[PDB]
Design a protein around this ligand. Sequence first.
Ligand code: MGT
Lengths: 152, 14, 739
Amino acid sequence: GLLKALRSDSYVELSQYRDQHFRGDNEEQEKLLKKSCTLYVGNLSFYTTEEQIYELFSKSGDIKKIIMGLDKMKKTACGFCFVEYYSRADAENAMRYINGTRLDDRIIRTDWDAGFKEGRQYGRGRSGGQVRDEYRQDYDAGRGGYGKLAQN
Amino acid sequence: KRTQIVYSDDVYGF
Amino acid sequence: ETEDHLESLICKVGEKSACSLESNLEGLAGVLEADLPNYKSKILRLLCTVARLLPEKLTIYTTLVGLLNARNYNFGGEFVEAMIRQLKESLKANNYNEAVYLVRFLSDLVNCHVIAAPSMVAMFENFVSVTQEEDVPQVRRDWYVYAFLSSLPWVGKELYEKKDAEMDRIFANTESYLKRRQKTHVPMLQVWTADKPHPQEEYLDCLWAQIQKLKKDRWQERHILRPYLAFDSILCEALQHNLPPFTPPPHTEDSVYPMPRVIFRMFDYTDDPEGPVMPGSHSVERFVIEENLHCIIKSHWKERKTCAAQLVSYPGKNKIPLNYHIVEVIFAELFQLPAPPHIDVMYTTLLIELCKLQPGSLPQVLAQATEMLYMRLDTMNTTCVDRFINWFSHHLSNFQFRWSWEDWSDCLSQDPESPKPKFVREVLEKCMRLSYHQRILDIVPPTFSALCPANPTCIYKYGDESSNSLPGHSVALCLAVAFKSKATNDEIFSILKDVPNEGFSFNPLKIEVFVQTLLHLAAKSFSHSFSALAKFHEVFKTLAESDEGKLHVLRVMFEVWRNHPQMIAVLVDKMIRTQIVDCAAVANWIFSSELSRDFTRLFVWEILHSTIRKMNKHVLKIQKELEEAKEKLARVLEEQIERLQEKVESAQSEQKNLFLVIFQRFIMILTEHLVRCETDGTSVLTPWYKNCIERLQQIFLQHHQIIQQYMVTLENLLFTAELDPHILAVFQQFCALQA
Ligand SMILES: CN1CN([C@@H]2O[C@H](COP(=O)(O)OP(=O)(O)OP(=O)(O)O)[C@@H](O)[C@H]2O)c2nc(N)[nH]c(=O)c21
């Protein structure tokens, strides 16, 4: 027998996000997310290396693959990535303890991903980078500068 | 401060 | 959902509230009595659950059961029956750590007039009588003694009033048992070998001393909340219950007992003179505080914000320096040998969340602790130092690498291989891996630039500055051209024919020019380097089919990437997974002369243990395919079980030979050192020896469960009476963990 309060594991719950280009139903997407060993990793610096992500994310377990998030046009790092673990348990621990901590002094944010396919490494915004980077007003040294509307 | 690398098209048992 | 309501009410009693604890308990006891007609079933299950999973709130729930016993005797009786079924069932299933909480619950129920004091003394007579069982492990005897002694801060006064003659007997037998206990395990489990400023005591010696002081003070302690004392009227008119006689489940060969422990200790009252006086090492108050704090972490480890909250809001009868206890308990878990209760990374993040809740006080305590850990480095076990290094570096990366490095200037005049400068070197290296070379150069003073990591750059043997008189220089340049121009496996092989030097298959220069060149052209990133190993995988498998080939791939790969240990680690990992090399090759490579100068560095042992872990998982995986195919038969396929059984045996054999190789190489180099030191009359305990003996220690600690399978082979063939007692001690320590 168990207590609900102790079974609580809120850092491992699904986020609001879904992949809009996902060939499938929503129930079919959630079914994959609940079994995934792959994490989307948000709010990275453009200058953060693959080798830094490996060092940090290795603290929750053994990493199978890191797929850097790239600008569709320029094919340079545009501030996200994917981290695939060999086991679910190691990915859960990343979501519990690496999620919301710092990498190159920025609070990174992790979410369950449905799985890598070709084309998913590329930013889906107009200008080539991430959608989040177009609309934003602020100045962010680590993400190019101003948002892509107010830049040019 | 640092240099970004560029990623190729072709970069992506026991 | 009255079912869900009842759970939430039972869980929420005892937490922070506008009303008193007494009021809430009385109130809830009323609400639960009302629902007994048609929720007795549920309420029993819930209270049995919180007895097992919420020992941190023990006296809240015993009081609650006591109040329910008063209003309904029959309910109390069914509960006490269910608890005894649960206790016997927990012991049967080797949940000895849950069983302690159940034993303490029953104990404190005596103070609530639910259990008759005679029954509890009878049970403890049977517990301590396990010390007179013959031909059983010390760790079995230990647990039954610990379950008894650790219950006494709650029930010790009540039992020693009602039955003082019977308890003096139990105490007599307990004392004479503790006197004849073997302490072989202790040096393997201490975080520090130094007994100043705080000895790291063996857990039963310490508990004994605590219970002795408690007894000397007429069983009076200043910490445990006892809500039941404010219901003295109601609880005295309640009738008591008797426990059945208890027969400890007898020792089988399927029995598995808790390993002994050594109590972590870094603080006393002198470390916090302003704040409330810290209970001393030998007070039960210190035991109870730390036991509850550990239990809180056990309950809420998954929820870092909740966990931090629950720790900060920990209640006691009297004021304590809670921030010091929280920090001490956290490092106690992190540095526990053989391993922490939870994943190491959790502790880093938990301490961050605590700094967030207590930003005015906690960060200063943590920095004070960090200072103390550093200053006591000279005798810290290597396994614990690795963890200290990984915590501190990761912590710094979450606070802009801000640290007053000049406070540790004492390291600069010391021998570079001493614990302090080594510690600083390794921390800065770990910082660099989370940052970049220039950032780490900037965040330290110029006195400390001798300890910074070097720039993680590739070393190509056949580059610009290299003379073209090197063997195979012209072949290297052809490979460079071929690789740049999307060459195929056959074209690379064809180029490698033009190179000098079963029947004879291994060429060291072919490997050397192939590896040097391929690694150089994929040096851009890990992804590029992995892609290169995948694309030319067939060339690797042909060049390194030989065991001396595998060893030479690793020799060359090291000469390329010796400034970038992180790269080495991930390449070795990929080469093992793709079968370019095998575990056995990596083991011999680590103990090779080419790594001699880097042997005491972290990355070497990160690679070894990572390599061992892949091997262990490989065997587990192949063992599950066998189990699954057998259950299919139980319900053509019989000819597939015979192939898998062959694979398990050869996998298990590869695993065993991996450990055997590691132990042979350790025994060799340790013997070499010890013989040299008896010849020269010089000190045995050098920094190199401290590291080497403690790294052997680590193999046993980290993999005790697998190594337990090889006991007969190790006693007979490797760790024999012929060995130097310095080396044999380690194996004897390892044996003590389940002896
Ligand atoms: C914000 N993202 C972005 N992302 C993935 O990273 C790649 C590029 O993301 P993007 O350019 O921000 O696309 P989009 O998803 O529209 O972003 P958003 O909806 O935040 O504006 C895509 O494969 C996208 O699915 C994500 N994947 C998961 N699992 N969770 C997430 O929260 C996110």
